[PDB]
Amino acid sequence: IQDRICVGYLSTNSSERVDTLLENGVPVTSSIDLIETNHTGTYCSLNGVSPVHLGDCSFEGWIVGNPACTSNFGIREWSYLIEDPAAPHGLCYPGELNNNGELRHLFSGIRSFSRTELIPPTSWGEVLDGTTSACRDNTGTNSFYRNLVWFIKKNNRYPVISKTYNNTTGRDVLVLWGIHHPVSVDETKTLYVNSDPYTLVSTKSWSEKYKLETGVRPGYNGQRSWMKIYWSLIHPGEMITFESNGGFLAPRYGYIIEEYGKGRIFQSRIRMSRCNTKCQTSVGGINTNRTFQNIDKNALGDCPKYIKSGQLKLATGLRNVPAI
Amino acid sequence: IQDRICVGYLSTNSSERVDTLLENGVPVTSSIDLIETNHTGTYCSLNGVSPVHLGDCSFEGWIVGNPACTSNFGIREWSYLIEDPAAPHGLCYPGELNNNGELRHLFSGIRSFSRTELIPPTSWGEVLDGTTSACRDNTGTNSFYRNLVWFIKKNNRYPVISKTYNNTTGRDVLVLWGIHHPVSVDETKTLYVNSDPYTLVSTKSWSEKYKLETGVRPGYNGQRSWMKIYWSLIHPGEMITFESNGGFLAPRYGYIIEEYGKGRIFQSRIRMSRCNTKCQTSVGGINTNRTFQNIDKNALGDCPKYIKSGQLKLATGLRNVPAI
Amino acid sequence: IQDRICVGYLSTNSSERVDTLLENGVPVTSSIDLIETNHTGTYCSLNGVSPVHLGDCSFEGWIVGNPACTSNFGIREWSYLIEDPAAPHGLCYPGELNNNGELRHLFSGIRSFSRTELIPPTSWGEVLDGTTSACRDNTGTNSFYRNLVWFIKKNNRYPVISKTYNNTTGRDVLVLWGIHHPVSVDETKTLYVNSDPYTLVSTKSWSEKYKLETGVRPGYNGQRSWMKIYWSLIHPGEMITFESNGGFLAPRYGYIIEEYGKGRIFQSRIRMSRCNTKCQTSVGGINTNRTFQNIDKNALGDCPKYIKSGQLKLATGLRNVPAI
Amino acid sequence: LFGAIAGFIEGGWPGLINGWYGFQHQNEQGTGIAADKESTQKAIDQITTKINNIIDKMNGNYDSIRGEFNQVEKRINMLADRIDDAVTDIWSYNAKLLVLLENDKTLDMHDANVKNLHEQVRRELKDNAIDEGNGCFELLHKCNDSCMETIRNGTYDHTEYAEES
Amino acid sequence: LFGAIAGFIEGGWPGLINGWYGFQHQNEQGTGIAADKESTQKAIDQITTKINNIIDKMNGNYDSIRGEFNQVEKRINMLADRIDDAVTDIWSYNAKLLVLLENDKTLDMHDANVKNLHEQVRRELKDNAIDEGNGCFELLHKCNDSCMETIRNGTYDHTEYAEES
Amino acid sequence: LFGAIAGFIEGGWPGLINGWYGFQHQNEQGTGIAADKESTQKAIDQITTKINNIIDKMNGNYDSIRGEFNQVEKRINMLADRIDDAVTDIWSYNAKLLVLLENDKTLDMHDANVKNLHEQVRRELKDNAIDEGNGCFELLHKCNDSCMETIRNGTYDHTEYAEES
Ligand SMILES: CC(=O)N[C@@H]1[C@@H](O)[C@H](O[C@@H]2O[C@H](CO)[C@H](O)[C@H](O[C@]3(C(=O)O)C[C@H](O)[C@@H](NC(C)=O)[C@H]([C@H](O)[C@H](O)CO)O3)[C@H]2O)[C@@H](CO)O[C@H]1O
Numbered sequence A, B, C: 001i002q003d004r005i006c007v008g009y010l011s012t013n014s015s016e017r018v019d020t021l022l023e024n025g026v027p028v029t030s031s032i033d034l035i036e037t038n039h040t041g042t043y044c045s046l047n048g049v050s051p052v053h054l055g056d057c058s059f060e061g062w063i064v065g066n067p068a069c070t071s072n073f074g075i076r077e078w079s080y081l082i083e084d085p086a087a088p089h090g091l092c093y094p095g096e097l098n099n100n101g102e103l104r105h106l107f108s109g110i111r112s113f114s115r116t117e118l119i120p121p122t123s124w125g126e127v128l129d130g131t132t133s134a135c136r137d138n139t140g141t142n143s144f145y146r147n148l149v150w151f152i153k154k155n156n157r158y159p160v161i162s163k164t165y166n167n168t169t170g171r172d173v174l175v176l177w178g179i180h181h182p183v184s185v186d187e188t189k190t191l192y193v194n195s196d197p198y199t200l201v202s203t204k205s206w207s208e209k210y211k212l213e214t215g216v217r218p219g220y221n222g223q224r225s226w227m228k229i230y231w232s233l234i235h236p237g238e239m240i241t242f243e244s245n246g247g248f249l250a251p252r253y254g255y256i257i258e259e260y261g262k263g264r265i266f267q268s269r270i271r272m273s274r275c276n277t278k279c280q281t282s283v284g285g286i287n288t289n290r291t292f293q294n295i296d297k298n299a300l301g302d303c304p305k306y307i308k309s310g311q312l313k314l315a316t317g318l319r320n321v322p323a324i
Numbered sequence D, E, F: 001l002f003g004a005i006a007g008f009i010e011g012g013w014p015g016l017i018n019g020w021y022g023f024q025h026q027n028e029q030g031t032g033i034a035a036d037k038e039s040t041q042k043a044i045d046q047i048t049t050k051i052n053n054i055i056d057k058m059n060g061n062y063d064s065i066r067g068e069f070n071q072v073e074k075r076i077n078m079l080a081d082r083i084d085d086a087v088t089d090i091w092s093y094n095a096k097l098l099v100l101l102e103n104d105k106t107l108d109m110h111d112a113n114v115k116n117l118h119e120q121v122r123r124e125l126k127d128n129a130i131d132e133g134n135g136c137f138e139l140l141h142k143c144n145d146s147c148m149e150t151i152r153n154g155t156y157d158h159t160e161y162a163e164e165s
């Protein structure tokens, strides 16, 4: 026979298959995966920034400073929050935090955080500091919320106290105050002397006047009255004044915050860890260069897009057709 | 001449034409439609589940139990609601349902529904049941909302009544209560005896105190006072207590609900029917295997995506080029 | 040699290059741009409709009729609003506009607008019109909001005044009213005589009762009391009644509106101009037939889609391969 | 485009039964039209897989994005509608473009198929036929009805005829 | 890819006027460059239809998804922005990818066009010319200026020259 | 489809090292398998650019669209989830379809590449070889190991052999 030259192409040992628009299960010499399916299964630091575990406290109890919670005095920043859905501790004294949904959203993640003293606890005037057996501290002593001070009558008299805060920080400042609603006009008399007390809170943009709503609530922890805690974000250069003659939980500590609402409040019962990823899910951390993922719709950070799909194989080689 | 063999392709009798990226109106031997354009033009059952027509009542009047409406006592489930925009019946007595937007949304569709008696109407204590000519029943007798009881003075005295409800159903429970605001301090005295009455409603998470707001409203149906009806979803294991000494519309019937907010409140004046589809629109039912539709943007269920487009023909055959 | 005929294709002098899915920087004989990058850099009329500059006033001060603002008496329509973020004028008297967010949204753009007198300013009864040094007019004379009338005691008596408005316009009508909260029970006595005055506002769907919240606010300009301005949209065929015996800022002018919420409130410090475009951005006007743009994500009207991308060149010619 | 359909084979065949592509023969003993079940069925499977993918892959939730609102919550109601509309605009454009792109590819696929069929016959015959450049082949020898069938089914051996040419 | 442009025909022709594809001839009496209006115009109509479809099919509402909010409604304000951003991210990726995919197909279309033109000329001449494998055909007979034109316009009959070859 | 892979060249070559396409020769002095670095590398660059574009162009924000809500704001919470879901449904369908469309184009690209390689060799040899119609060429003259290499590297000159044929 003669000299001969042939053109041909690659064949291999593969069960590798891809789907095309026109055909299912086409054998190919090589392919890659587009969807990320592997995660750490743990809570990780997010792009260098550690989260904050709330331990046995709910977010509410954490933010007001429930003495049973670990203090947030030393925190500087968090990428996200870890909260136990069945956390035992919250507002230790029977009460409610007003507009807590918005607050949760705004504290989901904050790049610059630091607690600060708005107004000195003794700078208020002639009043005492009230504690309660509902808010016991680490020891067992009666106490109260770190961020609020329960002012009561001193020497059978409750004077009209009035202080104001000036936002000089150059950043947004979260202020917290509260209103205590006693079980009866009798208790408000015992605690605040004045009948029908009031609290007036104002800025140069809004102004609220609070009166007491006496009655017996089916509370918890032994008390039967009710507390309503409010909050407001004071902007740089703004000022908020508090005036009261009873039933007032005064602001002591506030929070200086910058770049916030950048997080998430995960409630997943998975473990925290030393790892670091660019994408955290409620199921684990994800570190990948792939741009898709089918692990969990609840994800935060520089994440691949979550999609509802099985693995997607992109063909790189050619059709794998066996040797003649 | 010699023997010959030719290669060729199909030609047919068609005016069938498709558009391609590079050419308009290209003749083809066959094609299919991607967009569904046909519907029943009626209200149908949705995936086996019948809707609920509200007849001559608005949703508000239906949910509180306006005696003129047909009762929702026997309902167990609905896929969506049918409401007449100009329905004559609603809150028969001059009043407003608080936060009715949210409620409408939550009752648009419910997979598990059953009315239940929260608290026995006579278990409250020494009070009478008040009716009115504004809320007459099917007969013509003076009555009141099925779900609420208008408590008034019995023997010239209105005692401090207090009952509480325990959510033991294991599912979410909708509770309704109300506050009646008389035309004057004179009428509240006639009706409730006590001056400046109050109602205190509380759970272990929140607590509201209601006072009366006397005055003459430009109402309807004969009356000139005002009622404010409130609601709340009690979660499994939660409890709500009501305490009052006047001006209080007490909760009688509540609703046990599971898998809700899954519906829609259609207000289209089209007719109901025995058909069953997987997709309901405000214009008719849709039953198709197609994944697009251009009939109506207002659609519910396992629907094709609505798109703003004329019919889209997908070519299946080849270019139809006439015979030589 | 013989006669010869050759097939060939175009070559040109171009540095023109496009990217393809398989190759970067491919030379082509011709191409077009998909993204619009050029704008007017000014505020223009939008599709024939001129915007409305608010001058030195905030939207709040404009809508209530701050005497220092230019009147909106002659306006018929606007496509969008231009507001200075640091506008000196707003609510001249220390106060707040309730639910101003919604209002801003609804007045961002309106196709049919005209101010109207709801109730004659003297049709109220035996009361005087109060002015203030906080709301001085053009001249320097003490005045008040154009749209509200500050009713006060006349001849040491403040009668129970009550007027009602009937929406007969066939369109939606914005009504504004207000409540003045004096610095003390002493000032409310000086201004309205009656102790513990009230205002009752009602329609056939809702009803609000307002009481005074006395106290000293850290206000602005001379004053130290507080005003709360409310609003409501009255629908065609609806009516709203006002009843008061003090502390009431009565509705004088309202607005008849149709096709609203169609605009935007730009706060960009760029200049206004005689141009007209179909798309306005916070950075300038855009007039193009292209369907994409990378200039500004804040855009209004018949706009190209904003996308995060450098210029995208679509190839029209063929590959530009140099001559043999 | 592959230059076959509406190309060098300038016309279709009416009365081509049960097939898209096929053959037309003429020997001393008749004519002479049959579909090529092999390539036709293969093309039918591809079009079917295409259609099924386009439709079966849309398995998400596509009903309206809307809630219930009263007349006091217009803003949230307007945003809800604007978002629903935006989502609808994305699907609208994709649907129109996908169909245009796919029709483009479907016609070209058919063009490629009849061209690969023509080339397949040309390779069979080699020097035993003249390519007329219009889809037809003029045989240089005589072709039975059994000969035609071997050409159609791809088994025709050019060596078993070389000499009569 | 069809192996024509930047393929076996290794270069473009500067000074090809009013056309994308064309012919270059040389007989005893001159040269010899003309565009093929037929195939060029057909390609121009396709590119135009393409461009028009890509743009005309975008007939929805594409301005911002945003409302007006005061400083107390930050959450709803942040969601509105996030949704606007998400919608923008969808269009961004689609725009970049569509252009890449379309440029890919546009260049290949041109490649296919000059290849189908070359094949068209090759079918005309048949044995009356030698295929030089670079876009050129060496005629075996003499070709008038009128002969060249019949080759260009597709009417050239190979029978009317068979013998001089 | 270009009719090469799984077409007229009916099988692949196991033991084709460091390449997708290549040659297999046999002269008096051995065999005879080598990859075509030119066309293989060019194809590898294209697949790489494709993959990089598909991935690098996704540079937006793709984490969840969700906020924090209490149990009293269910509606706004349900809309937020429905919108997140809708955005996810758009990306889901696009991802599945893009991969199907791209796999389609990738296989056909390879098919086109080996077909353009086969045509390239056929143009080199011209009349110095017989096209066997299965990827092989039967040389009519003798071919050194140096001759084979000139065929592989595209420099083979048909004039330098014309006579032995
Ligand atoms: C000229 C003259 O004296 N006319 C009387 C006429 O007043 C009276 O009718 C009564 O009028 C009063 C107010 O003036 C109420 O309007 C009474 O109607 C209702 C009602 O039907 O709803 C009566 C009803 O029984 C009441 N329901 C309850 C629980 O108390 C309500 C209710 O008090 C109010 O709605 C609350 O503000 O009032 C109406 O009967 C007639 C008959 O008494 O006699 C004329 O001579």
Ligand SMILES: CC(=O)N[C@H]1[C@H]([C@H](O)[C@H](O)CO)O[C@@](O[C@@H]2[C@@H](O)[C@H](O)O[C@H](CO)[C@@H]2O)(C(=O)O)C[C@@H]1O
Residues within 6 Å of the ligand: C129, C130, C131, C132, C133, C134, C150, C152, C182, C183, C187, C191, C222, C223, C224, C225
């Ligand atoms: C309608 C009216 O009464 N306008 C008054 C205004 C109001 O009475 C006041 O704002 C109520 O809170 O008060 C004004 O002037 C006086 C001041 O110059 C003085 O310093 O303090 C007075 C009370 O102690 C009162 O504020 C004002 O704005 O002009 C007077 C104005 O007519």
Ligand SMILES: *[C@@H]1O[C@H](CO)[C@@H](O)[C@H](O)[C@H]1NC(C)=O
Residues within 6 Å of the ligand: B166, B168, B239
């Ligand atoms: C009902 O509530 C009471 C509160 O006193 C609680 O003790 C009881 O356990 C609840 N019911 C059930 C079955 O848990």
